[PDB]
């Protein structure tokens, strides 16, 4: 089904076909591509091959420097694009395989490519939808009997994030300065954050908007989910704890948030859908959906420090843990008439399962700095050190192939 | 004083001392474009852009051809100062260049009355601060209790939260009463329905000029270089939705259904004549928040409410920006201290501007004390929270000798819920 060979270890078989923005040494202009094997198929080069009804008059979306306009076309266009790509790669429509002059312009090596943020993100929201993550933060901060606050099981709690500091995989992250209060009996101090953390999340991009004042009913929520990326919500826990009452996390989150560049479309993930977790209490009707919209995605996080020769896997978790689905999050986010826009990023929350090996932050893995995490070669961590590199990966396991997400990586630079 | 060839009423918001920037279109020409308000006219900068011949602007005249102010904001203070001096000259009663060019005036001016204003910039990120000591005290009492009403961090840093950028709308945009989830009965599950405690919040906000690079703080001594100018803002709020949702991650759907700004961006140079010494802070802030430069402004603010049956709008709040405890310089410095990258056109709002006098409380949550006191809105008529069809208008002015620097309107009418 693909004339482009795909190795067994590839994140990018024919069943994936994610969208990203890339550039090369020869042509520095960011442009839209699709990953296949170790190659990128350049959609600006092949834009004229999308001849179907939804795209024939809208080929210009493939000439843009971001995915926003393609996202905003909606599901008929996404489905047509994916079918066109499938038919070109199988050579059912043989133009791309057989037009050698087009072909040699259209495919470039991933290894030689530079990736960019896939969209101009107008608004970013971070949810809090893993019951074990919220419970753990609760146990650590408020105690076992108060682990979950009263609203949590009733709505998908979330907060507005900082869009400007969402950066693409591979961007170094500087340890932030700020204010903290390490001794509650004394005034706060200014200094480098001491409790620098990662957060394993996933996120989706919004497709067509909704108009200002017009909620998206849950029945239609699936029409607005374009596809998914990996996210690391870097966090400065000492800055966070001091600032956050009563208006929520702010500078403890906004110094950096990393996403992976390849946006895996929802149609690629639908084969990996599983039943939705039972919610008790049942949510209010506006949040109810029968459609399965929970996904079996195997997630891993590695840490490698300065001097260390091998990265250690510190977390293995799964997106299927989450209590509230993306449909519920999208619907709740628009219930009040808030206008979601193409390229908005809605993140899941930190993805922790019940097994401590699956906790999605070092705040949890180290239990607030009370337990050392073994990172191999005689080294241990509670929170991140200068020079540490964190890499998140994710895969769906098919029969004889995997749909992978590439990398969501960053290295910590010293405070300056 | 100082005079334009364009006639200006004594109490006009838009004398030659102001010269605010905005984005407008007309019935003749739908392209949104950059203008400056003067008297009851707009001067179209796209038409006169070739008159900006100075060193900061001569190679950057295209910023005046844009559909938003972002690029001009991004050029920084030498460009802003050069544009303002060029406009003060061009609009002067004693300057012939534009005054006597009949055909150019025909193309360059249009009446405010027939213009449609648009949002002045594409706002990448919006942040709302919480910098009125009285407002934070009042909401603490009403949502949480008198004990620690002002929470332990408030006197040490300018508390703020990330707001929703997409739902910042220009003055005049109707605001639909939001649906959502609320918990009016503590002994029952939450319910879904129309908000019952719909509120306004009197704020001001500033737009960021040049940004800072990702990872690079803005030191407080340079913060003034990044503040372009100000608008009025109404942070519409759904207090029942807010109270149920906000612990522990903050206000969310209780704010994001709509936030209105006025369209004319008053540049900081226009406001500097109205600067006053900063309020004393005790405890003294940490050094990174310590600045001697005066950056508190005497701006008289007013809020009116007009019900769907009324002929006279009632003034329900009179307050002043000079009441705020933390300055814009402190807010911008704190926002970037961790390396967060502010970008041109970002909007940083002050917080609700409540003074200590109850007549200066900047929200109906406060003026009605969470529905326990009636607000007088005219003969016989009262409010606690906003009703369908109510129109809220925020205005603001700095008063000089024989002129004002005004802000135009920040208006919205409440539509019924779905
Ligand atoms: Ca934003
Ligand atoms: Mn997070
Ligand atoms: Mn507010
Ligand atoms: Na972050
Ligand atoms: Na609002
Ligand atoms: Ni892989
Ligand atoms: Ni062509
Ligand atoms: Ni069409
Ligand atoms: Ni309950
Ligand atoms: Ni204190
Ligand atoms: Ni099978
Ligand atoms: Ni004079
Ligand atoms: Ni006025
Ligand atoms: Ni230049
Ligand atoms: Ni005064």
Q: What is the DSSP string of A363-383?
A: HHHTTTTTSPEEEETTEEESS
Please enumerate in sequence order all residues whose Cβ is within 8 A of that of B352, keeping only pairs 6 or more positions apart, or say none.
B130, B132, B135, B201, B202, B203, B235, B362, B363, B366
Distance CA B46, CA B35 (A): 8
User: By C-alpha distance, which of B71, B412, B117, B113 is closest to B263?
Assistant: B117
User: How remote is the CA of residue A118 from the centroid of ligand 14, in Å?
Assistant: 30
User: Which of B4-9's residues contact partners 24+ apart within 8 Å by CB, and which partners?
Assistant: B4/B38, B4/B39, B4/B91, B4/B92, B4/B93, B5/B91, B5/B92, B5/B93, B5/B95, B5/B98, B5/B99, B6/B38, B6/B39, B6/B41, B6/B91, B6/B109, B7/B39, B8/B38, B8/B39, B8/B403, B9/B39
Cα–Cα–Cα angle for B147, B148, B154, rounded to 5 degrees: 160
Bridge partner list, A36: A39
In chain B, positions 11-30, which contact chain A (CB-CB < 8 Å)? none
Beta carbons of A188 and B339 less than 8 Å apart: no
Residue A284 has what DSSP assignment?
A: P
Catalytic residue selected from B135, B226, B334, B335: B135
Torsions phi, psi of A39, nearest 5?
Answer: -110, 160
CATH of domain B4-116: 2.30.30.230
Resolution in A: 1.4
Q: Which tokens hold the place of B399?
A: 């008063």
Give the torsion sign (CA, A261, A266, A269, A272): positive
Q: Which two tokens stand for residue B199?
A: 């509120």
Nearest chain A residue to B163 by CA distance is A160
B110 is in an annotated binding site: no
| Nearest ligand for residue A181 CA | 10
Nearest to B398 by CA among B297, B311, B283: B297
Q: Where are the alpha helices (DSSP H) in A230-386?
A: 237-243, 251-254, 266-269, 326-334, 362-365
**Which residue, among B68, B154, B339, would best test binding to A if mutated, counting the most A CBs under 10 Å from its CB?**
B339
Assess contact for B287 and B249: CB atoms under 8 A: no
Domains of chain A: which residue ranges?
2-114, 116-401
The active-site residue, picked from A48, A58, A60, A133, is A133
Burial letters B114-137, b for 16+ CB under 10 A, else e: ebebbbbbbbbbbbbbbbbbbbbb
Q: Which of A335, A346, A156 is nearest to B176 (CA)?
A: A335
Token pair recorded at residue B108: 């360059």
Give the ligand whose atoms come closest to the C-alpha of residue A166.
Answer: 4
- Taking phi over 0 as left and psi of -120 to 50 as alpha, with beta for the rest, A113 belongs to beta
Tokens read off for B6:
């364009």
Provide the token pair at A54. 């939804």
Nearest to A160 by CA among B151, B110, B29, B256: B256
Task: Give whole-number Cα distances, A231 to A137, A157, A158, A297, B157, in Å.
Answer: 19, 18, 16, 14, 29
The correct CATH number of A116-401 out of 3.40.190.10, 2.160.10.10, 3.30.160.60, 3.90.850.10 is: 3.90.850.10
Q: Closest ligand to B275 CA?
A: 15
CA distance B273 to B401: 11
Torsions phi, psi for B80 (to 5 deg): -65, -45
b/e for A229-239, b at 16 or more Cβ within 10 A? bbbbbbbbbbb
Q: Which residues of B touch A338 (CB under 8 A)?
A: 164, 166-167, 253, 256-257
Which whole-number Å values give the CA distances from B354 to A124, A355, B383, in the listed order?
A: 30, 49, 19
Cβ B191–A284 below 8 Å, yes or no? yes
The CATH code of the domain at A2-114 is 2.30.30.230
Residues with CB under 5 A from ligand 13 (ion): B 13, 406
Measured on CA atoms in the order A184, A188, A191, A192, is the torsion positive or negative?
A: positive
In angstroms, the CA A251 to CA A238 distance is 10
CA of A8 to the centre of ligand 6 (A): 10
Contact B248, A244 (CB under 8 A): yes
CA of A192: which chain B residue's CA is closest? B338
* Alpha carbon B389 to its chain's center: 23
Is A204 within 8 Å of A227 (Cβ atoms)?
A: yes
Residue with tokens 């076309």: A73
Cα–Cα distance list, B209 to A27, A141, A176, B228, B342 (Å): 31, 39, 23, 5, 9
Output DSSP code: residue A295.
E
Q: Please, what is the Cα angle at A36 between A31 and A38, to 5 degrees?
A: 95
Collect all residues with Cβ–Cβ distance below 8 Å to B4 and sequence separation of at least 6. Answer: B15, B16, B38, B39, B91, B92, B93
Please tell me which of the candidates A122, A179, A416 has its beta carbon nearest to residue B157: A179
Q: Domain B118-403 is in which class?
A: alpha beta
Query: Largest Cα–Cα distance of chain A, in whole Å?
Result: 75
Method underlying the structure: X-ray
Is B21 buried (19+), middle (13-18) or exposed (0-12) by CB count in 10 A? buried
Asked if residue B330 lies in contact with residue B285, where contact means CB atoms within 8 angstroms, the answer is yes
Who among B125, B130, B179 is closest to A163 (CB)? B125
**Closest of B123, B347, B354, B337 to residue A243, by C-alpha:** B337
B224 is catalytic: no
Which residues, 6 or more positions from B225, have their beta carbon under 8 angstroms from its beta carbon? B76, B77, B209, B210
- When CB atoms are compared, the residue of B157, B249, B253 closest to A243 is B157
Which residue in A119, A214, A336, A342 has the most chain B C-beta atoms within 10 A of its own C-beta, making it the best mutation to test that interface? A336
Give the span between the Cα atoms of A365 and A380, in whole angstroms.
12
In whole angstroms, what is the distance from residue B203 CA to residue B347 CA? 12
Structure tokens at B54: 């100075």
Tokens encoding B304: 């009116």
C-alpha dihedral (B134, B140, B145, B147), degrees to nearest 10: -70
**B286 contacts in A (CB within 8 Å)?**
179, 188-190
């Amino acid at each position: 089904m693909s004339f482009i060979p795909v190795a067994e270890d590839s994140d990018f078989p024919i069943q994936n076909l994610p969208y990203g923005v890339f550039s090369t040494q020869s042509n520095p202009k960011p442009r839209i591509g699709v990953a296949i094997g170790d190659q990128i198929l350049d959609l600006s080069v092949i834009k004229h091959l999308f001849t179907g009804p939804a795209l024939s008059k809208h080929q210009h979306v493939f000439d843009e420097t971001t995915l926003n306009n393609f996202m905003g076309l909606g599901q008929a266009a996404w489905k047509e694009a994916r079918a066109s790509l499938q038919n070109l790669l199988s050579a059912s429509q043989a133009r791309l395989r057989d037009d050698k002059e087009l072909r040699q312009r259209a495919f470039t090596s991933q290894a030689s490519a530079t990736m960019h943020l896939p969209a101009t993100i107008g608004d970013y929201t971070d949810f809090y939808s893993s019951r074990q993550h919220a419970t753990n933060v609760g146990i650590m901060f408020r105690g076992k009997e108060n682990a979950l606050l009263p609203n949590w099981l009733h709505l998908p709690v979330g907060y507005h994030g900082r869009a400007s500091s969402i950066v693409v995989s591979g961007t170094p992250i500087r340890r932030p300065m700020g204010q903290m209060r390490p001794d509650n009996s004394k005034p706060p101090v200014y200094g480098a954050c001491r409790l620098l953390d990662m957060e394993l999340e996933m996120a989706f991009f919004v497709g067509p908007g909704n108009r200002f004042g017009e909620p998206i009913p849950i029945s239609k929520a699936h029409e607005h989910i374009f596809g998914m990326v990996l996210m690391n919500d870097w966090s400065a826990r000492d800055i966070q704890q001091w600032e956050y009452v009563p208006l929520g996390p702010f500078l403890g989150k906004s110094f950096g948030t990393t996403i992976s560049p390849w946006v895996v479309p929802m149609d690629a993930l639908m084969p990996f859908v599983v039943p939705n977790p039972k919610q008790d209490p049942k949510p209010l009707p506006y949040l109810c959906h029968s459609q399965p919209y929970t996904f079996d995605i195997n997630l891993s996080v590695s840490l490698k420090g300065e001097g260390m020769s091998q990265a250690a896997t510190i977390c293995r978790s799964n997106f299927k843990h989450m209590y509230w689905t993306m449909l519920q999050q999208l619907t709740h986010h628009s219930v009040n008439g808030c206008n979601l826009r193409p390229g908005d990023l809605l993140a899941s929350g930190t993805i922790s399962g019940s097994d401590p090996e699956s906790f999605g932050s070092m705040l949890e893995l180290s239990w607030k700095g009370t337990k050392a995490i073994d990172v191999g070669q005689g080294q241990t961590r509670t929170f991140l050190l200068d020079g540490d590199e964190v890499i998140i990966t994710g895969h769906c396991q098919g029969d004889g192939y995997r749909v992978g997400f590439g990398q969501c990586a960053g290295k910590v630079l010293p405070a300056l």
